Design an enzyme around this catalytic site. Structure first.
Site, PDB file in Angstrom:
ATOM      1  N   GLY A 197      -3.304   1.347   1.618  1.00 24.02           N
ATOM      2  CA  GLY A 197      -4.090   1.112   2.822  1.00 24.02           C
ATOM      3  C   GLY A 197      -3.402   1.031   4.262  1.00 24.02           C
ATOM      4  O   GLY A 197      -2.158   0.684   4.154  1.00 24.02           O
ATOM      5  N   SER A 198      -4.192   1.277   5.126  1.00 24.62           N
ATOM      6  CA  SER A 198      -3.700   1.120   6.469  1.00 24.62           C
ATOM      7  C   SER A 198      -5.071   1.146   7.624  1.00 24.62           C
ATOM      8  O   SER A 198      -5.963   1.519   7.249  1.00 24.62           O
ATOM      9  CB  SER A 198      -2.691   2.272   7.060  1.00 24.62           C
ATOM     10  OG  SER A 198      -2.022   1.984   8.124  1.00 24.62           O
ATOM     11  N   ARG A 212       6.044   6.224   6.775  1.00 23.48           N
ATOM     12  CA  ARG A 212       7.413   6.168   7.639  1.00 23.48           C
ATOM     13  C   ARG A 212       7.935   4.688   7.225  1.00 23.48           C
ATOM     14  O   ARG A 212       7.159   3.988   6.827  1.00 23.48           O
ATOM     15  CB  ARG A 212       7.252   6.403   9.202  1.00 23.48           C
ATOM     16  CG  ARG A 212       7.358   7.910   9.435  1.00 23.48           C
ATOM     17  CD  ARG A 212       6.226   8.062  10.690  1.00 23.48           C
ATOM     18  NE  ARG A 212       5.005   7.762  10.370  1.00 23.48           N
ATOM     19  CZ  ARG A 212       3.988   7.306  11.272  1.00 23.48           C
ATOM     20  NH1 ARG A 212       4.360   7.329  12.488  1.00 23.48           N
ATOM     21  NH2 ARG A 212       2.897   6.810  10.590  1.00 23.48           N
ATOM     22  N   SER A 238      -4.420  -2.842  -1.718  1.00 23.98           N
ATOM     23  CA  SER A 238      -4.158  -1.994  -0.575  1.00 23.98           C
ATOM     24  C   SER A 238      -5.568  -1.871   0.352  1.00 23.98           C
ATOM     25  O   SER A 238      -5.161  -1.721   1.661  1.00 23.98           O
ATOM     26  CB  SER A 238      -4.099  -0.312  -1.138  1.00 23.98           C
ATOM     27  OG  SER A 238      -2.514  -0.260  -1.588  1.00 23.98           O
ATOM     28  N   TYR A 241      -5.288  -4.045   3.516  1.00 21.60           N
ATOM     29  CA  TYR A 241      -4.517  -3.617   4.577  1.00 21.60           C
ATOM     30  C   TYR A 241      -5.323  -2.388   5.589  1.00 21.60           C
ATOM     31  O   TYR A 241      -4.630  -2.187   6.793  1.00 21.60           O
ATOM     32  CB  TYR A 241      -3.119  -2.949   4.154  1.00 21.60           C
ATOM     33  CG  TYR A 241      -2.439  -3.939   3.620  1.00 21.60           C
ATOM     34  CD1 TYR A 241      -1.544  -4.826   4.363  1.00 21.60           C
ATOM     35  CD2 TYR A 241      -2.129  -4.286   2.475  1.00 21.60           C
ATOM     36  CE1 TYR A 241      -0.750  -5.869   4.181  1.00 21.60           C
ATOM     37  CE2 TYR A 241      -1.255  -5.123   1.768  1.00 21.60           C
ATOM     38  CZ  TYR A 241      -0.247  -6.027   2.683  1.00 21.60           C
ATOM     39  OH  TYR A 241       0.112  -7.052   2.224  1.00 21.60           O
ATOM     40  N   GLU A 322       3.461  -4.488  -7.115  1.00 20.80           N
ATOM     41  CA  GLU A 322       3.553  -3.648  -5.766  1.00 20.80           C
ATOM     42  C   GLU A 322       4.978  -2.598  -6.166  1.00 20.80           C
ATOM     43  O   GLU A 322       5.665  -3.169  -7.018  1.00 20.80           O
ATOM     44  CB  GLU A 322       3.752  -4.470  -4.444  1.00 20.80           C
ATOM     45  CG  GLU A 322       4.667  -5.373  -4.467  1.00 20.80           C
ATOM     46  CD  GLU A 322       4.611  -6.075  -3.179  1.00 20.80           C
ATOM     47  OE1 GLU A 322       5.261  -6.234  -2.034  1.00 20.80           O
ATOM     48  OE2 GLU A 322       3.262  -6.996  -2.932  1.00 20.80           O
TER      49      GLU A 322
HETATM   50  C1  LIG Z   1       4.983  -4.728   8.664  1.00 20.31           C
HETATM   51  N1  LIG Z   1       4.796  -6.224   8.528  1.00 20.31           N
HETATM   52  C2  LIG Z   1       5.516  -6.471   7.172  1.00 20.31           C
HETATM   53  C3  LIG Z   1       4.726  -5.935   6.068  1.00 20.31           C
HETATM   54  C4  LIG Z   1       3.174  -5.724   6.216  1.00 20.31           C
HETATM   55  C5  LIG Z   1       2.440  -5.014   5.288  1.00 20.31           C
HETATM   56  C6  LIG Z   1       3.294  -4.513   4.151  1.00 20.31           C
HETATM   57  C7  LIG Z   1       2.714  -4.185   2.756  1.00 20.31           C
HETATM   58  N2  LIG Z   1       2.782  -4.649   1.494  1.00 20.31           N
HETATM   59  C8  LIG Z   1       2.102  -3.900   0.803  1.00 20.31           C
HETATM   60  C9  LIG Z   1       1.851  -3.960  -0.790  1.00 20.31           C
HETATM   61  C10 LIG Z   1       1.025  -2.997  -1.500  1.00 20.31           C
HETATM   62  F1  LIG Z   1       0.891  -3.304  -2.755  1.00 20.31           F
HETATM   63  C11 LIG Z   1       0.403  -2.199  -0.833  1.00 20.31           C
HETATM   64  C12 LIG Z   1       0.374  -2.095   0.763  1.00 20.31           C
HETATM   65  C13 LIG Z   1       1.248  -2.857   1.336  1.00 20.31           C
HETATM   66  C14 LIG Z   1       1.779  -3.090   2.504  1.00 20.31           C
HETATM   67  C15 LIG Z   1       0.969  -2.295   3.766  1.00 20.31           C
HETATM   68  C16 LIG Z   1       0.910  -0.704   3.287  1.00 20.31           C
HETATM   69  N3  LIG Z   1      -0.106  -0.647   2.639  1.00 20.31           N
HETATM   70  C17 LIG Z   1      -0.398  -1.066   1.433  1.00 20.31           C
HETATM   71  O1  LIG Z   1      -1.395  -0.515   0.618  1.00 20.31           O
HETATM   72  C18 LIG Z   1       4.662  -5.008   3.778  1.00 20.31           C
HETATM   73  C19 LIG Z   1       5.467  -5.624   4.938  1.00 20.31           C
END
Ligand SMILES: CNCc1ccc(-c2[nH]c3cc(F)cc4c3c2CCNC4=O)cc1
Length: 345
Positions: A197-198, A212, A238, A241, A322
């Protein structure tokens, strides 16, 4: 003139939406006059990351208010904000530092989107080509769509009850150069179709440059397993996010083929600088895992679309799994879903 299917045209408009970019910057309280979209610069954002790292270090070290105020003012000098009547919030805790780091992450991708957009043919077709990505609609009646809809339906977490998910469109995507880049990892064992997700304002950057890793200068706060690419096997982990809201309830989510190979299995936070020799990924172990007996093979890749059941693991920091890789070449993006978020109010 554009011969692209309507859903693909709608996707291009959504990803290159300048009004969404400006709305994001207003929400962040960025001064749009002092830092317009066209003036965003890698070197200034890099310098801003470094200052946020100094702030994070100052706060956890219990530094004086003077040195914290100094660093906080230096950040706001690099990245001009407009708080109107309110005075500038002091960056004196980890959550505030992480929020500003995540703002910078989003700003960099907004800069990429705006730079592409301003870098005979229909404007939609012109902007499509700038993504350097083949985008095809997956037919709703196909077995392909049925598998993806089932993955969405089955892996919605019980504790993520703020919204329901509805699949609007399924796109099959091929980023230029990604096949050649992925080739070495293509014969690695334990390849898995996982969620990423983003924010919608990141997707021009994601499609043109791929997923990235955070730069070294970025602060360490909130990277549970260090600086890598994070994926979920639960759609809702996801989907969170996407940072969708009642005002903007349409989100974009990726299905990536991730070459996990030998997983370094962890129950608790560890900031990975280097994997143990012979390990290719980290798996954060959740209390809940997709039923492995319902695991399916889609084009030689494992799809964990089983309903959430108890894992073996009670002694874990995580509710849900994760997956993290530390090499950008270990990801091959396969699908992009446009999801409707139906909030329960
Ligand atoms: C950038 N600030 C710290 C940070 C922010 C977000 C994430 C993160 N952890 C996840 C676990 C997961 F299972 C899926 C996702 C994420 C994310 C963001 C990326 N997208 C995801 O779906 C990791 C670190």
């Amino acid at each position: 003139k554009s011969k692209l299917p309507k859903p693909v045209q709608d996707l291009i408009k959504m990803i290159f939406d300048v009004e969404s970019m400006k709305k994001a910057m207003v929400e962040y309280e960025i001064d749009l006059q002092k830092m317009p979209l066209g003036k965003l610069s890698k070197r200034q954002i890099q310098a801003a990351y470094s200052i946020l790292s100094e702030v994070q270090q100052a706060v956890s070290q219990g530094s004086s208010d003077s040195q914290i105020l100094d660093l906080s003012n230096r950040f706001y000098t690099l990245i001009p904000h407009d708080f109107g009547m309110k005075k500038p919030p002091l960056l004196n805790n980890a959550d505030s530092v992480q929020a500003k780091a995540e703002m910078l992450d989003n700003l960099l991708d907004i800069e990429v989107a705006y730079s592409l957009l301003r870098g005979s043919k229909d404007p939609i077709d012109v902007n499509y080509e700038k993504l350097k990505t083949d985008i095809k609609v997956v037919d709703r009646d196909s077995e392909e769509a049925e598998i993806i809809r089932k993955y969405v339906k089955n892996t919605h977490a019980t504790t993520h009850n703020a919204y329901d998910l509805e699949v609007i469109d399924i796109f099959k995507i091929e980023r230029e150069g990604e096949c050649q880049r992925y080739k070495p990892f293509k014969q690695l064992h334990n390849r898995r179709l996982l969620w990423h997700g983003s924010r919608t304002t990141n997707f021009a950057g994601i499609l043109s440059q791929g997923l990235r890793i955070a730069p070294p200068e970025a602060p360490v706060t909130g990277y549970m397993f260090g600086k890598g690419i994070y994926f979920a096997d639960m759609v809702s982990k996801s989907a969170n996010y996407c940072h969708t809201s009642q005002g903007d309830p349409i989100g974009l989510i990726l299905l990536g083929e991730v070459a996990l190979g030998n997983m370094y299995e962890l129950k608790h936070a560890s900031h990975i600088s280097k994997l143990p020799k012979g390990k290719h990924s980290v798996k954060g172990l959740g209390k809940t895992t997709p039923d492995p007996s319902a695991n399916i093979s889609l084009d030689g890749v494992d799809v964990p679309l089983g309903t959430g059941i108890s894992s073996g693991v009670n002694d874990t920091s995580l509710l849900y799994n994760e997956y993290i890789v530390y090499d950008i070449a270990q990801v091959n993006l396969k699908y992009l879903l446009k999801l409707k978020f139906n909030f329960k109010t």
